Amino acid sequence: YFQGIYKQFTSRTLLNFFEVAALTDGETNESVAAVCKIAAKDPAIVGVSVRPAFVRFIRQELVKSAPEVAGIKVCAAVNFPEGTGTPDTVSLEAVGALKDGADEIECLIDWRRMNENVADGESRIRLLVSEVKKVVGPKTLKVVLSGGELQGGDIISRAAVAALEGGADFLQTSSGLGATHATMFTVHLISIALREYMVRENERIRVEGINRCIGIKIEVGDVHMAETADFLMQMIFENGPRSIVRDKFRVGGGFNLLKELRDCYESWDSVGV
Amino acid sequence: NLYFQGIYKQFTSRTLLNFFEVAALTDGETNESVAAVCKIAAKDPAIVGVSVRPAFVRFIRQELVKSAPEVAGIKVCAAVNFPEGTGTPDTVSLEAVGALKDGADEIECLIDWRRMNENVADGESRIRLLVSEVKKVVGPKTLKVVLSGGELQGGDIISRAAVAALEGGADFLQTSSGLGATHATMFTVHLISIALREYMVRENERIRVEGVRCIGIKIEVGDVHMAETADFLMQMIFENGPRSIVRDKFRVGGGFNLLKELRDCYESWDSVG
Numbered sequence: 436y437f438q439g440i441y442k443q444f445t446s447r448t449l450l451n452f453f454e455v456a457a458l459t460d461g462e463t464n465e466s467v468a469a470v471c472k473i474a475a476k477d478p479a480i481v482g483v484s485v486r487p488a489f490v491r492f493i494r495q496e497l498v499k500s501a502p503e504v505a506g507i508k509v510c511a512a513v514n515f516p517e518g519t520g521t522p523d524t525v526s527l528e529a530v531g532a533l534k535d536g537a538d539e540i541e542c543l544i545d546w547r548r549m550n551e552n553v554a555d556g557e558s559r560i561r562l563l564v565s566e567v568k569k570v571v572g573p574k575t576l577k578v579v580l581s582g583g584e585l586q587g588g589d590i591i592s593r594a595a596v597a598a599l600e601g602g603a604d605f606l607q608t609s610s611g612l613g614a615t616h617a618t619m620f621t622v623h624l625i626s627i628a629l630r631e632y633m634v635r636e637n638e639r640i641r642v643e644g645i646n647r648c649i650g651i652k653i654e655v656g657d658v659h660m661a662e663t664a665d666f667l668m669q670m671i672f673e674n675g676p677r678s679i680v681r682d683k684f685r686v687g688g689g690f691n692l693l694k695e696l697r698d699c700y701e702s703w704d705s706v707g708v
Numbered sequence: 709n710l711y712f713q714g715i716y717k718q719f720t721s722r723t724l725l726n727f728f729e730v731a732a733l734t735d736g737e738t739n740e741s742v743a744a745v746c747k748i749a750a751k752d753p754a755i756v757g758v759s760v761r762p763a764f765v766r767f768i769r770q771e772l773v774k775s776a777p778e779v780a781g782i783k784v785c786a787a788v789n790f791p792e793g794t795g796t797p798d799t800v801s802l803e804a805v806g807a808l809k810d811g812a813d814e815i816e817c818l819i820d821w822r823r824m825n826e827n828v829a830d831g832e833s834r835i836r837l838l839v840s841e842v843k844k845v846v847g848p849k850t851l852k853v854v855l856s857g858g859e860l861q862g863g864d865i866i867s868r869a870a871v872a873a874l875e876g877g878a879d880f881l882q883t884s885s886g887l888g889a890t891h892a893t894m895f896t897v898h899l900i901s902i903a904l905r906e907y908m909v910r911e912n913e914r915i916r917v918e919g920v921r922c923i924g925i926k927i928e929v930g931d932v933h934m935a936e937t938a939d940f941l942m943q944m945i946f947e948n949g950p951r952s953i954v955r956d957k958f959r960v961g962g963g964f965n966l967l968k969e970l971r972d973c974y975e976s977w978d979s980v981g
């Protein structure tokens with residue numbers, strides 16, 4: 436009688452934290468518009484991630500024919516796709532994106548510098564993230580660690596810590612463009628790094644009586660809903676049910692996954708209400 | 709397909725445990741039977757709490773905790789004006805004071821549903837007075853008001869009962885008591901959701917004119933199985949949104965067998981990485 440209810444509930448839940456990527460080089464106003472309409476369909480997902488080139492299109496032109504797109508956040512991807520910018524150049528990409536109407540910024544780290552020399556890599560991350568955060572202000576800055584490109588768990592952990600020290604509001608597992616995406620292993624390392632950092636942060640605030648919310652974005656790429664649900668379970672186990680809130684958790688995925696989530700959710704029989 | 713066949717049920721079960729309140733209110737309860745329920749409730753991950761008659765509150769809070777320290781981690785909700793809802797506001801207030809004195813964290817109070825059915829106008833006034841005097845003794849603790857939707861005769865009566873309870877100071881509207889057969893849960897949830905939504909609108913206006921508190925919905929499902937319970941969870945999100953799926957605004961009440969079913973499902977998920 437209630438066939439499919441578990442998958443339907445899971446889909447509804449994932450929609451609530453979903454951020455769809457429209458970041459390839461081949462993107463056009465047409466492809467981007469198609470993604471934004473499905474993202475903004477009631478109930479709207481959290482937002483869409485695009486390269487700076489499509490921010491004004493969504494915020495100023497698309498909204499004329501598709502008013503609902505004003506209801507989703509636009510996250511601009513800076514320092515993409517190789518993470519080879521300088522703090523100044525990346526900060527300027529951010530300035531332009533925010534001016535065009537971006538609500539959030541996702542910034543890739545120079546993962547190559549991390550792999551050649553960890554100490555220097557950490558220094559570069561702190562500088563990059565701090566300068567970008569200065570221009571982003573109170574808006575959300577997600578730092579993409581590119582876990583799959585980092586060589587070793589120690590490096591991933593160090594990159595996470597450096598990003599936090601630089602002022603990241605969110606730690607994002609992968610870019611959405613790369614060959615590798617989240618793995619249970621990488622999510623685990625990121626969770627531990629964040630948890631340990633917050634323990635130290637909260638201990639200081641408590642003992643000194645001083646009185647930011649830091650999230651984890653699991654980028655799954657083009658996997659299906661089943662695997663995505665497994666990550667959702669990992670987040671709950673590692674970080675608790677209270678971490679499953681928009682200011683602390685996001686799920687990044689592709690357009691096909693978004694369509695799968697909507698098709699699943701829409702199959703729930705709502706005739707009773 | 710043979711892969712990921714249990715992930716959605718596992719996630720749904722984990723979610724339900726996060727909001728679950730197990731009822732141990734039968735006439736035949738003994739300290740031993742109550743202790744058995746509390747142990748399963750308190751098992752990691754602990755559910756929200758247990759609902760018992762005032763007679764078992766001191767046992768759980770002072771004795772049981774000596775051999776089962778984990779029970780300190782679950783809330784104890786004491787049922788008053790139970791199970792008939794025909795007590796006088798003064799006597800019900802004394803029952804509440806006694807429960808709170810024994811260590812109760814929350815109070816579940818039934819309304820005089822019979823009165824609502826024989827004279828709506830009179831019934832509403834009795835609810836306002838009962839809820840108001842009980843809330844006065846509960847103070848800052850949570851007062852859940854049981855409407856006994858299955859026993860009220862008609863949607864108009866249910867709606868009026870909900871409005872009277874809200875105006876009286878209820879912190880939660882509960883569909884049924886947790887003892888006996890449950891009827892019209894879906895209908896009661898729908899009516900309660902509407903009543904609460906408009907109450908919030910009117911109450912905010914009322915506050916501004918003087919120059920609103922957190923109110924929850926507790927869906928008591930009875931002895932139904934997990935799939936039907938999940939459908940009620942889905943009903944709650946659909947009608948009230950993802951922001952309503954938080955402990956301060958939502959609880960699921962069910963029996964001991966349902967609790968065991970939820971744990972067995974969740975435990976099948978492999979947390980080891």
Ligand SMILES: OC[C@H]1O[C@@](CO)(O[C@H]2O[C@H](CO)[C@@H](O)[C@H](O)[C@H]2O)[C@@H](O)[C@@H]1O
Pocket residue numbers: 731732733734736737738740741742744745963964965
């Ligand atoms: O542990 C008590 C819990 O068990 C249930 C079964 O789910 O009832 C059992 O225990 C009672 C002892 O109080 C018996 O009266 C009953 O016959 C037995 O099935 C729940 O109803 C109860 O809360």
Ligand SMILES: OC[C@H]1O[C@@](CO)(O[C@H]2O[C@H](CO)[C@@H](O)[C@H](O)[C@H]2O)[C@@H](O)[C@@H]1O
Pocket residue numbers: 791792859888
């Ligand atoms: O069935 C309603 C009718 O039954 C009485 C007793 O004859 O109460 C019984 O049913 C109630 C609702 O299920 C219970 O609350 C009560 O415990 C049970 O004895 C009447 O009082 C009521 O009008």
